[PDB]
A paper describes a structure:
Cyclic GMP–AMP synthase (cGAS) is a cytosolic DNA sensor that produces the second messenger cG[2′–5′]pA[3′–5′]p (2′3′-cGAMP) and controls activation of innate immunity in mammalian cells. Here we show that cGAS-like receptors (cGLRs) are innate immune sensors that are capable of recognizing divergent molecular patterns and catalysing synthesis of distinct nucleotide second messenger signals. Together, our results define cGLRs as receptors in animal cells that are capable of detecting diverse pathogen-associated molecular patterns and dictating response to the foreign environment.
To define the function of cGAS-like enzymes in animals, we screened predicted cGAS homologues for suitability in structural analysis and determined a 2.4 Å crystal structure of the human protein MB21D2 (hMB21D2; encoded by C3orf59) and a 1.6 Å crystal structure of a protein from the beetle species Tribolium castaneum (GenBank XP_969398.1). Despite divergence in the primary sequence, the hMB21D2 and T. castaneum XP_969398.1 structures each reveal close homology to human cGAS with a shared bi-lobed architecture, a caged nucleotidyltransferase core, a Gly-[Gly/Ser] activation loop and a putative catalytic triad. A conserved groove is present in both the hMB21D2 and the T. castaneum XP_969398.1 structures, but is notably distinguished by the absence of a Zn-ribbon and the insertion of a C-terminal α-helix in hMB21D2. We hypothesized that the remodelling of this groove controls the detection of distinct ligands. The hMB21D2 surface is overall neutral with no obvious capacity to bind nucleic acids, and no enzymatic activity was detected with a panel of potential activating ligands.
Numbering used by the authors: 28 to 430
The structure:
């Protein structure tokens, strides 16, 4: 009976959730806060070194690392960090290097050489102090006629952001080490700076990302404001559409030195309050299954799976999403969606639906993942049973170091 197959997945999804959820005691909670406090003070000292970072800055801390697909970043060409082996808890931190207003969108966002969901950032119309403050981090474009333009470069900013962190941390290393978190690793992986801190028994991974902060909602995502979504009535619209980000990632066509990617990372944090726990549990189970065998050569990012999980919140009324016994049906629905998107090489962005997030995949690689997915679809409980063992093994690796 197919009802017996549903109960088996419901049991495995519930068992997977038991070992996947992070529960910290009072000791681990202080170890995490001490590491976060050191990161925040480090960024404060980075602002004191070069007066480039804003004096009044607002960071965005997320519970997962970049390689876990928490933000729309290009996960390819990123070295792999294993939980329990290299870190015990992972985090990503968006550090705004610039703060702009809603009125500054049509005059600073240059999207004439960029695909959808991407843009250049023109600093031409800023005051002379800001232009001179970021002149070394911009792509200067001189013209025979017309004003010289300054495009905020994601590459130059990342190198400066990494050098500033390296300088601040190197000075702290000279002074005696008492009460300071032992820095396990400092690496510049593309436009991402990864720091592993050792505070007590646990190790913390922080993927710090240099970001451009914007106030208001993107003009290219205007249509997303014109339909009633699932969060309508459960959370206030002001908390969702109050701002967006520019993440240092380019499209497969754009210029790596000039192009940013629009990120709705803080809109999704507010939307997580409305997503049902059952659909969320199936998402975490589906993520632990596919990202293993669907990562090479061109990985399908967990953010691609997060978008489909978000798409499933609107196309689907709250009734079927509410009942907890339908967790197996949610996991299979995400697998069927991950099949349809691969077959047509089409995965629309949840906030900018006309943006295809799979246009960078070749026809060969997307067919290979579709054949690998058919083996997962035919036996979803077995791939989930293996994913539970990978989480239990990582939970004992972290515990062995804490013990």
């Amino acid at each position: 009976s197919s009802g017996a197959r549903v109960e088996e997945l419901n049991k495995l999804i519930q068992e997977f959730t038991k070992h996947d959820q992070r529960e910290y005691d009072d000791q681990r909670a202080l170890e995490i806060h001490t590491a976060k406090d050191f990161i925040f003070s480090m960024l404060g000292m980075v602002q004191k070194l070069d007066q480039k970072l804003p004096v009044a800055n607002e960071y965005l801390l997320l519970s997962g690392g970049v390689r876990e697909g928490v933000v729309d970043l290009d996960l390819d060409e990123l070295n792999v960090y294993a939980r329990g082996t290299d870190y015990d808890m992972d985090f990503t931190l968006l550090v705004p290097a610039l703060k702009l207003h809603d009125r500054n969108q049509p005059v600073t966002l240059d999207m004439r050489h960029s695909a959808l969901c991407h843009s250049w950032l023109s600093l031409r119309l800023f005051d002379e102090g800001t232009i001179s403050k970021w002149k070394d981090c911009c792509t200067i474009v001189d013209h025979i006629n017309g004003a010289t333009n300054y495009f905020f470069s994601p590459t130059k900013v990342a190198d400066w952001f990494y050098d500033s962190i390296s300088i601040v941390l190197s000075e702290i290393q000279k002074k005696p080490q008492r009460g300071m978190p032992k820095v396990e690793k400092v690496e510049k992986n593309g436009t991402i700076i990864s720091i592993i801190l050792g505070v007590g028994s646990s190790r913390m991974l922080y993927d710090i990302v240099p970001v451009v902060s914007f106030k208001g909602w993107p003009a290219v995502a205007q249509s997303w404001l014109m339909e009633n979504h699932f969060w309508d009535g459960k959370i206030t619209e002001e908390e969702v559409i109050s701002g967006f980000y520019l993440v240092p990632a380019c499209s497969y066509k754009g210029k790596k030195d000039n192009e940013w990617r629009l990120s709705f990372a803080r809109s999704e944090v507010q939307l997580k309050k409305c997503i049902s726990s059952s659909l969320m549990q199936a998402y975490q189970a589906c993520k632990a299954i596919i990202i293993k065998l669907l990562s090479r050569p061109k990985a399908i990012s967990p953010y691609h799976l997060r978008s489909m999980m978000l798409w499933a919140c609107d196309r689907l009324p709250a009734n079927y999403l509410a009942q907890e016994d339908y967790a197996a049906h949610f996991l299979l629905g995400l697998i069927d969606d991950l099949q349809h998107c691969l077959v047509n090489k089409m995965c629309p962005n949840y906030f900018i639906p006309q943006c295809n997030m799979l246009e960078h995949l070749s026809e060969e690689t997307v067919m290979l993942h579709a054949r690998k997915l058919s083996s997962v679809r035919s036996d979803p409980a077995e791939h989930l049973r293996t994913a539970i063992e990978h989480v239990k093994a990582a939970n004992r690796l972290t515990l062995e170091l804490q013990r």
